Amino acid sequence: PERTFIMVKPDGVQRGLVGEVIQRFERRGYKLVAIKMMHASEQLLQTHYEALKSLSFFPKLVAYMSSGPVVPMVFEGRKVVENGRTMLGATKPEASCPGSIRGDYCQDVGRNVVHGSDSTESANREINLWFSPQELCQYKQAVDPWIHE
Amino acid sequence: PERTFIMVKPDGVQRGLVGEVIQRFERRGYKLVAIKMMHASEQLLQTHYEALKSLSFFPKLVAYMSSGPVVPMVFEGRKVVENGRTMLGATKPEASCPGSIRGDYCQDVGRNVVHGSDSTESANREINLWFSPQELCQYKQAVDPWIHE
Amino acid sequence: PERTFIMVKPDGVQRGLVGEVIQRFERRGYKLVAIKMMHASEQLLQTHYEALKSLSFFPKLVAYMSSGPVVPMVFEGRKVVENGRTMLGATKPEASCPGSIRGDYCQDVGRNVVHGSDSTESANREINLWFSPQELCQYKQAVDPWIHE
Amino acid sequence: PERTFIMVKPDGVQRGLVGEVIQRFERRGYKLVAIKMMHASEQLLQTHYEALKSLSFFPKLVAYMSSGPVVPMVFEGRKVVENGRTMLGATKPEASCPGSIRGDYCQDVGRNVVHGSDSTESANREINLWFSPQELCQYKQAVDPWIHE
Amino acid sequence: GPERTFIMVKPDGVQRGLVGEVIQRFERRGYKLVAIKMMHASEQLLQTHYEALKSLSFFPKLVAYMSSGPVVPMVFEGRKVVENGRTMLGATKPEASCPGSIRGDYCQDVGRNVVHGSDSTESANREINLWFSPQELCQYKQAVDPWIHE
Amino acid sequence: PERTFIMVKPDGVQRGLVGEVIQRFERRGYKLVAIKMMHASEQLLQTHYEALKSLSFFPKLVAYMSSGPVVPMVFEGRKVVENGRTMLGATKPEASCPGSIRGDYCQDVGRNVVHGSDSTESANREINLWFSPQELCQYKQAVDPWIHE
């Protein structure tokens, strides 16, 4: 029952990359179990980035992430946290390999299209911060016997 | 601004076509302004499909549309209602042209992946049934001067 | 269980379009049940194209279809015959809609990349010419409940 | 040797669709024989649209077509003029089929991404207006026997 | 003759509709398809295919899984097709696979990793001869040959 | 601004990959600012490859690069030189990652489809060698605030 938190940032929304991000996870067999588009409040973004609160760029980041709508979502599947990190690519786009989201679409670390949880512990916290238990949908994937051993 | 209601049906979710549906609208420059994943109640489905009650086998439709999660969403832009119909393709996939969603992905009118509003009046009615006003997001598309005159 | 006969012609093989033809049927949920690559004999081609002997330049057709390998295959699913015809596009590529195989890839009716059965009667006849019953594979598609009612 | 004139308009340049337009023609086996990016003077655009110069929307059209770079190009192959029309789609995007350029990417006739010749006579005029003979390249396509009969 | 490699879509690749995708990855790199078929593989054939694994604990589970649905064996031809085939498929474990590889794009689980490919030219020639008779292998001259290799 | 020189080689033109190369840069937000198709002269190619002029393979490389038309072009954006190298992939295709141009399409170092500048100094020299200043176009990209921080 592993899950990860993925969020399309304001630049991903502006550039029309929301569907592209979702499709990369769907094609790897991962289950979409929650999604919404929203204007994130300052307090929500400060709690989301709480590990960065002591850093000089924290206020600039929180303001940028509230400057347009975001699309938080949740995917479920085997090794979805670690594979999600690989699929997004390095934080620095010039260090990202081609075929990753940031390697294909991004030029600047400050405009890198999408967030993903960096660990299981972070994923569980971020999922519960952005989504209430009622917003998490549950279903049995038909192709389940052919994606997992 | 013109808006239309698009909803991925439970078979579209199962088959991993949510991102595909979204990308077809983003590709055409349309703005995503709301989206969520949910289990639709029978009462919501019966009101949504009020017009089809004069047709045979209404319980089969309600049971199909509540057999898994759905993804309702709202897109904004010029002629988005009529263009949304063309992009989805004919209701019957056999009558749909390749390049449309149903022409590319569907074999059966009863499993046709996605719903879209058939008129401006239906779009306004459906948007208000599925989304509260606070759920619709507002932003200014950077490419606006290049997608319409 | 409806089935249709699809065959990539020698120009489709040369131009690297075998995977593209197969993927157009797979993404619509159709089941691949047989496939091979072969050099078709003149006797097989004359029987396959029996109905075209009433048209001019029959030796030219047999020679072209013998000028390189072909890839016959069989797909199974609801309305696969009539949808197969639409997916391939009009015989003349200049009458084919964009989104069809011939509309996307072909310039010449004489080099139109792929063959498909025009009827269920023709499909049954063509499947028997090209494949022994022992070559057809049988399996249960996991997504079956989601591609048709 | 049939040829047509295709030109990406300023909105197609801005939206990063130059490669998409070119690929639509390459995948149908058409030969790129000339291409360049330029800022077209008002005077050059007035000659290209000579037929519209007395109409009320003429100053608006010339200002838009000089508001950014354009990419004129020439493609060669059988039926390239008529097939180019179908591949671009109807002038008004809302009348365009899915799978055409304007059906996939455009919302507004005034921002319809790309121009293409409407006839052999227009193609010859437009090619000779935008390109000198020395800019037209000549080569023998290796797949020629597999695209032509 | 030219270098060849054996590629086979596994039962999960067939179920998930990925046969055309695998083929197209090789075609777009200029490689020539020279044989292909869909079949139910017997346990006898699969034990010989995986004979180097016969001493390992997971061998019976692997043979049973690989016979639980149809597979699509095929053969591609071209310069360095064995080595490049391995790179295109990606690492055995999908979580170690780079994005852009088949397993990195589509797979979650090493036991459901969609496709097999030969790991050496010796293996490639043994696997081709095991799954295909010489008559099933087709020969043609690729038109773009002068533009894909020097 | 940062610019890099990219050139589709004669095999990339023959194989219909010109639009694919362009789209790889466009989708990463890089601006196309110059392009043309031409038959490169022996003297032009000798100057382009002047760093290799003492090597054994130099005459054969120069001869091959004039054996068909090429498509030189210029892209502009942040880190476009280093990212261009990554997007093209290793010089030898067998050392190239999947997702790069050479990793996706090439088998042979001598037929590796595309050239790209290896440094800022090389890019400036190559741009001025192949393009006169009147061929370089500039425009204000609308999505600039969403690709650069």
HSE toward the beta carbon, residue D34, CA cutoff 13 A:
20
Active site residue D39: no
Residue pair B110/C78 in contact (Cβ under 8 Å)? The answer is no
CA distance D111 to D101: 12
Q: Tell which residue, B1, B135, B25, B5, has the closest CA to residue B81.
A: B5
CA distance E7 to E132: 12
Q: Burial, C132: exposed, middle or buried (Cβ in 10 Å; 0-12, 13-18, 19+)?
A: exposed
Partners of D111 in the β-ladder: D108
Find the closest chain E residue to F12 by CA distance.
Answer: E147
Type of residue at D123: A
- Catalytic machinery residues of A: 115
The enclosing domain of E35 has a CATH number of 3.30.70.141
Strand order in the sheet with E115-117: E32-36, E72-77, E4-9, E115-117
CA distance D86 to D101: 9
Residue pair D126/D112 in contact (Cβ under 8 Å)? The answer is no
Contacting partners of chain F (3+ CB pairs under 8 A): A, B, D, E
Q: Tell which residue, E149, E105, E107, E139, has the closest CA to residue E1.
A: E139
Retrieve residue C45's tokens: 């081609």
E30·F103 Cβ contact <8 A: no
CA distance C33 to C35: 7
CA distance D52 to D50: 6
Partners of F32 in the β-ladder: F75
The parent domain of residue B53 ranges over 1-149
CA distance B17 to A23: 7
Cα distances (angstroms) measured from residue B105 to each of B84, B110, B115, D100, E118: 16, 13, 14, 18, 33
CA distance B100 to D96: 12
Interface of A with E (CB under 8 A): 27-30, 77-80, 82-83, 86-87, 89, 97-100, 103, 143, 146-149
- Catalytic machinery residues of F: 115
Phi, psi of B107 (to 5 degrees): -115, -15
C19·E25 Cβ contact <8 A: yes
CA distance C79 to B94: 8
CA distance D144 to E18: 30
Domains identified in chain D, total number: 1
CA distance F143 to A86: 26
Query: Which region holds residue E114: left if phi is over 0, alpha if psi is between -120 and 50, else beta?
Result: left
Q: Which helix (H) or strand (E) holds F45?
A: helix F42-48
Retrieve residue B125's tokens: 């009615």
Q: Tell which residue, F53, F51, F71, F52, has the closest CA to residue F9.
A: F71
